Amino acid sequence: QDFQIRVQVIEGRQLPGVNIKPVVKVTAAGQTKRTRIHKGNSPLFNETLFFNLFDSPGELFDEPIFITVVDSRSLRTDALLGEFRMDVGTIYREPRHAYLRKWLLLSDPDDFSAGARGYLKTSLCVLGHFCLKVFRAEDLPQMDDAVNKKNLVDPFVEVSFAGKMLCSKILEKTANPQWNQNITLPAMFPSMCEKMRIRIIDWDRLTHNDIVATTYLSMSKISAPGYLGFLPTFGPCYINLYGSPREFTGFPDPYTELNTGKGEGVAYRGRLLLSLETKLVEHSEQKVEDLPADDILRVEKYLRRRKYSLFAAFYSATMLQDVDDAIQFEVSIGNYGNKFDMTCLPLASTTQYSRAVFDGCHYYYLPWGNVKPVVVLSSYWEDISHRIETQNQLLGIADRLEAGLEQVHLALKAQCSTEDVDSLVAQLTDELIAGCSQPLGDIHETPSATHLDQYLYQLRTHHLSQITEAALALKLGHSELPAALEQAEDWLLRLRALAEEPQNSLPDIVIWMLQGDKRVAYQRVPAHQVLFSRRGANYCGKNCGKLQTIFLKYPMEKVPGARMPVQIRVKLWFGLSVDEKEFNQFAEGKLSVFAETYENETKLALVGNWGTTGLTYPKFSDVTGKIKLPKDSFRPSAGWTWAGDWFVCPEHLSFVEEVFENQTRLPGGQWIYMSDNYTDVNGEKVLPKDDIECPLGWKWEDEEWSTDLNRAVDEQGWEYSITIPPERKPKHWVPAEKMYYTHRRRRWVRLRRRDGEGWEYASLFGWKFHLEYRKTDAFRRRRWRRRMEPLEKTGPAAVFALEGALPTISCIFDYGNRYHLRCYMYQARDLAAMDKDSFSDPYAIVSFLHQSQKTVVVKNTLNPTWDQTLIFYEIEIFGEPATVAEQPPSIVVELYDHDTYGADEFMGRCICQPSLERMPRLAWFPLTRGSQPSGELLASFELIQREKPAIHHIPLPYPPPQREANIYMVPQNIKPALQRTAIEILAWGLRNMKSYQLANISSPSLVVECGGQTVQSCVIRNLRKNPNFDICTLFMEVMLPREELYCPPITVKVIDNRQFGRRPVVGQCTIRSLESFLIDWWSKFFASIGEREKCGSYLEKDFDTLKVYDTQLENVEANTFKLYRGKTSVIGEFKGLFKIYPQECLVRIYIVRAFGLQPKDPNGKCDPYIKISIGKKSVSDQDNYIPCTLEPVFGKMFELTCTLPLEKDLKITLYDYDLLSKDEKIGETVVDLENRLLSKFGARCGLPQTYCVSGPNQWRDQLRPSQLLHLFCQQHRVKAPVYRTDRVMFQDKEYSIEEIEAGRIPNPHLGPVEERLALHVLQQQGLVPEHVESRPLYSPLQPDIEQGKLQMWVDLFPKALGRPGPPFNI
Ligand SMILES: [Ca+2]
Ligand SMILES: [Ca+2]
Ligand SMILES: [Ca+2]
Ligand SMILES: [Ca+2]
Ligand SMILES: [Ca+2]
Ligand SMILES: [Ca+2]
């Protein structure tokens, strides 16, 4: 009769106290447990615990569940924060016998009238006012079908907090609505809800109401506890909206769920002007009231719409895959810079279209090179720079605290001594002191200050001055390094939390990729990260003017992703238009805008010479051709001048080339070759697949341009189109084959290794242009440009004044630095398994700017050792030498599983920064498959600046030794120190698992897997009856490193031996560190208690006394491995030994006396009796219950049997008899008897101080003390003893009987002198004396309340050793 309780504890909100480290001590009917340690006032425990107890269901469904959450400081005891006492039967009677995600109150018995001590969210199981004043909105996207231009939206604001929902008035046909309404939320503070849900809703008269956006207001970010505590206030300020893309094409939008609030929004949706105050009364009331004209005038002083100037320098666009057509990049902030509305000036906000080209190993890149496209925008946003200067200062001190923190841990991992790390935490703290004594921006004189700005100003100055005084307290109070470490994360978490600015009305810069009209990949760089301030470097953004590495993501990508789209390096800049002069300090390179015109000519098929025959177009024109533009149509603007003359000009070790194929058929037919069958990468007639040859100085080493199928195509490798009028050629290709299609396109691969005046030509005007004259051309044009640069008296700040141009903007570099990268890739670990053999074939593609390579494949191994250096010869980086050194481009190493058939699969990527050290050591970079880590990689990267730069005209140490020919090896001094170890192995048993895979653990066996040197132990033949391995000793040898960072954790694995190959892998193990593996009998009974009157002269005749343990036995102070699951942790155990060098027993339980019981019954009687459950056996001692006594004398005999480990536990209870009701419980206590046998002392039989054959000290152990010490000599390899009449030898040392009985009476009960002295020697071996356990019980209703004491003593002897002595009476 057993029942089980499942308790799942999720989170807590608004806990009492400050800076706490809470944890939940869940207790079910006296059985205690503990959850995971967490941080802050809002913990996120998410743990699951289980309990079980043996009793009737009528006695288990009345028990309480305890959710006792306490604050647990590292040097302080548990202080109570929450406690409740719900009933198990209130879970059991309800449906599912369970609660699911129920919100719970918290309370404290210090003051129950205080109400909520926070909240909690939990799941059980049983097994067998706010015055929200909304003013206006603007830039709301179209959501009604056209046939007023952009006013196709009917918005109204719905606000829902704490479950109560309200709505605003509808305003039809307006993209800039003017509500000016007040909505009073009746939610009493606090509640279970923390975050406010606000949606603008497009009203529809006939269909369902579409959703515009959803923004969130976290109340803890706008409120404080506390005198420095205030009710949540917000506004009047704009909050930005994010969701689906703005382009209303009709149809169901595939990114519809983005604007419902879930996931990061992909595009700007407008903004809401709103405020909130707390008119908090307990008289709950809600209403929507139209404002008078007085409330509108107060918000107009906050809308100081300054002009904002935006800069974006696109340095590189690499890492690119699945390229379709030319790729351009659009920069926008808010609705300014959205290229689909066609309202902007012809400068627009996008880079020019660029066809990607294959980089030579795996990826593609845009070949910008020395010309970087530039996007410059103008916008109108409010002057919120007082807020942004605050949060850039707080984030700035935060990231120098964080980088200094891992700098301290870097020296600790480098084993620097105590005085170097003293200097590192010293320079951490005084630089923190200078950064924090920097004064905050006063907000008192600024009329754009709201209520929340003034409240955060007092909050920030008070709290950061507390950081200052704590830093001075650590400056003289020199504690230990861990004690300063807990403080170090404390001010870091405080500074990051205070740095939140909920009134950030500046929208994030949404940088986009467009492949045609299709928006593909995005990132929202925050506007605070790039905004400029006049006040200095500490108040500027982190990437304000600095080069920023950005990894774009797909829409609705809640993950880092499997296929990364692209990697960009943008030199973003933002700031005031009056502060745009300060861009001159940040800029580098000759910023240019090319004045341009096109002069066109023609030659038809019957002409033969270039002239004007057949050109129905203007001669001098733009790139469109139809619109005339002469040479002097583009002139220098205000601040510009020409920088040159008119001219006629357009813009490593291995490589891999891609070849292409093309065919055609009729509908209903079969595929045949066309005339254009061997063509170029776009599909037009060029030199064939074999006429493209190797250039001079290189050689082929692939035998043939081979077939390829590693792409998104069908089974035959083709992608298919249909013929579309008016041209004779198809237009849109899709990678599936259907019956309609008339053309198809294939691909190929090969590889190789290293040992007319500027005219452009086209087949027809407006058709496909290229830079060379070939046989298919009949039209042409020439590329006039003249370079224009800003005046030197204004610098590169003059680009922002390019308004009224009617052009491309490009940061031309006259030079580029030359660099040389080496990627020391030694080994990896813990990688995912992808193939059917539970292994993988890892090879790592390593990329750096455009150049990429890949390592060799290590076949069928999850712990590869490539030992390979990928050498990137002559990679060029543009910019200043100092700029690219401090901000190197990000090396991204992604691992892939090689498949001989099919396609390769993703294994995980890591982002690393190359070190400029001349020999930088290896480190572990954690691989991620996006949603989870999938291993670690022992790599290192070295980036060397070379001797000379490569000049672009105006239009190293030795290589390492080779492991294999043409494959470089990671060098000797950088390699980890592998060395020869021989390990002696022990395996003796396993303890304490649960069930696994629909069955119990019947016959487990163990395999040791250190470094691939596999050894296997024997099998525990049946663990449920004996948990013992057959064979003790084993041997193995393992290749192992010397430093614990580089060293592999030990992989052990345990497999259940089930029949016919059906063995389940029931567990694994991970050893984190290896530092541990290099006168009558009643005269004796009352003398032990202390009752002299009933003892008599037993004490005065020099007899012994056993130890009556009035408290529990755990007060006595008297290798082990732990089984590991991947997710919760510790599940079981294993016993053995590793030395690194260069089962049934007889039981006799006696229950004799109890005392200290209370009169539980209201008439004053307590009637106790025992109940002990050991396996199948149960005690039904109600037959001999003792009525109406506080101190009963049971005095009974219980002969029993036990087997390890199912019957190793002794749980004993007491119940009090009742008249008509069920016998109520008194208490319980437990002992685990396995550790008494497991100990090397052999502490099973407690030792009397002298040996006696009979009498009170009559022997009980299976062997006499001489044979016991001889057993100690065989077990611990001590030399065998020699016994005489008077003296006894141990460790060949001579001990005599006068050490025992000097001044003591030689009682006639005493046995042989050999047994007296040998028993004395085991007393010197640390053996416990004789045991009687008078263990205090504990209340199930309260684990801190004792419930009397219960005296007992237990015999336990495994029958294989011998026959124990006969029992005696009590
Ligand atoms: Ca609609
Ligand atoms: Ca509508
Ligand atoms: Ca595979
Ligand atoms: Ca594979
Ligand atoms: Ca009773
Ligand atoms: Ca009673």
Author numbering: 218 to 345, 380 to 398, 411 to 489, 511 to 935, 946 to 1049, 1066 to 1116, 1140 to 1288, 1307 to 1429, ...
Please quote the authors directly.
Ferlins are ancient membrane proteins with a unique architecture, and play central roles in crucial processes that involve Ca2+-dependent vesicle fusion. Ferlins, such as dysferlin (FER1L1), myoferlin (FER1L3), and otoferlin (FER1L2), form an ancient group of C2 domain Ca2+-sensing proteins present in almost all eukaryotic lineages. The top arch of the ferlin ring, composed of the C2C-C2D region, is rigid and exhibits only little variability across the observed functional states. In contrast, the N-terminal C2B and the C-terminal C2F-C2G domains cycle between alternative conformations and, in response to Ca2+, close the ferlin ring, promoting tight interaction with the target membrane.
To understand how ferlins are organized prior to membrane recruitment and to clarify which conformational rearrangements accompany their membrane binding, we obtained additional cryo-EM structures of Ca2+-bound soluble myoferlin (residues 1–1997) and the closely related dysferlin (residues 1–2017), at overall resolutions of ~3.2 Å and ~3.5 Å, respectively. In the lipid-free state, both ferlins adopt a generally similar ring-like structure, formed by only six C2 domains. The rigid Fercore module is well resolved and has a similar organization in both ferlin structures, including the C2C, C2CD-FerA, and C2D domains. Importantly, in both structures, C2C and C2D coordinate two divalent cations each, and alanine substitutions of seven aspartates in their top loops abolished the Ca2+- and membrane-binding activity of the Fercore. To confirm the physiological relevance of the lipid-free ferlin state, resolved here at lower-resolution for myoferlin and dysferlin, we subjected soluble dysferlin (residues 1–2017) to chemical cross-linking in the presence of Ca2+ and identified the cross-linked residues by tandem mass-spectrometry. Mapping the cross-linked lysines onto the cryo-EM structure of dysferlin (Appendix Fig. S14A–C, and Dataset EV1) indicated that 66 out of 71 observed unique cross-links (~92.96%) occurred between residues less than 35 Å apart (48/52, ~92.31%, when omitting the more dynamic C2G domain). Importantly, the existence of characteristic interfaces between C2B, C2E, C2F-dsRBD, and C2G, as observed in the lipid-free dysferlin model, was strongly supported by the cross-linking data, with only five outlier interdomain cross-links being observed, all of them involving the flexible C2G and the anchor loop of C2E. Consistent with the dysferlin cryo-EM map, our cross-linking data placed the C2E domain between C2B, C2D, and the C2F-dsRBD module. From these analyses, we conclude that the lipid-free conformation is indeed populated in solution, possibly representing the default state of ferlins in cells.
